[PDB]
Amino acid sequence: PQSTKRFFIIKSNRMSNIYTSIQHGVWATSKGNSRKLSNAFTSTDHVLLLFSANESGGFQGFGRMMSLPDPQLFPGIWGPVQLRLGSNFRVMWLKQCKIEFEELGKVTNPWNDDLPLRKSRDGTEVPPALGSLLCTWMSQRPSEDLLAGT
Template sequence: GGDPPPPGPRCPPVPPQQDAQRPPPRQMQPQPPAGSASRPPPRPSQPAPSQPDPTPAPPPREDRAAFLRDGKCRFFVVHVRNRRDLNQAFSTCQWPTNVSSRMKLNEAFSTVKNVLLVFVDISNQALAGVARMEGAISKQRAMIARRPGAASGSTIPLKWISKDSLPSSESGKLVNKWNNNKPLCQSRDGQEVDTESGEAAVRSLL
């Protein structure tokens, strides 16, 4: 039994193979089914068109008769002698008046909130519009043509409530109790009308 031979030199351990050096596995491309080679790719879905907002509700109609409930009103007849003067008043919101009517209307304007003027076309006995007196009548000279015989250059500042007309067949049903119950359209220029008849005349034009 002799001694065992001395051990020889050891081999260094083999390092493990790095994954980075390993080529990635080959990806298999899916094959399109038969007969679909000419089919275009599906288009991306489009979002549904937004629905337009519903039409907004119209604003509430202005209550043009509200002033009749705001406070006491007084009503006066104004004679219209020709359509030209009336059309001019529609655009200027001024109406020429005489001294007698100016004093009467200014007195009324100082006592009530609403002084309403019912315009009467004396050529056909029809109502021709209604306006509210917007201020006291001054003595300044009128800038619009006055009818012959008018004694003053004063004008009435107006706010038109209605520019509509009412034919004599309808206006003839309205009377003025303060003029012996005669038809309202037969009242004198500047004559006051009782409250009930005045309101009826105004409402007939709204």
């Protein structure tokens, strides 16, 4: 199905993933999520990725998926974990910020079995009404220098 904008939660297990992603405009995900994001990319004007570190209580920003997984793109940049991921794809971060799940109140996701937004696993899609607002709220905050003090 075609659509204009779709929105996916991305979880990061180590902060260095986010720092590498910001420095080089790149991401990779599990093989199943890679297929899901690739299918969205070719049928949707904009695929937005909303980044949330495992260890954090919220989002560190959001970006646009710019290209499909490409085995030639930054091969092995994540280290040996590359062996259990799909191929790398380009991402343009549109905002670096700090927004806590708790700042949003107790939001649940009807496209994820009524789970709290804060319990979203990697690759969880959110409905556009919620995804658009999350991105709007992130954009309206001061940018956070995520790489400061790292």
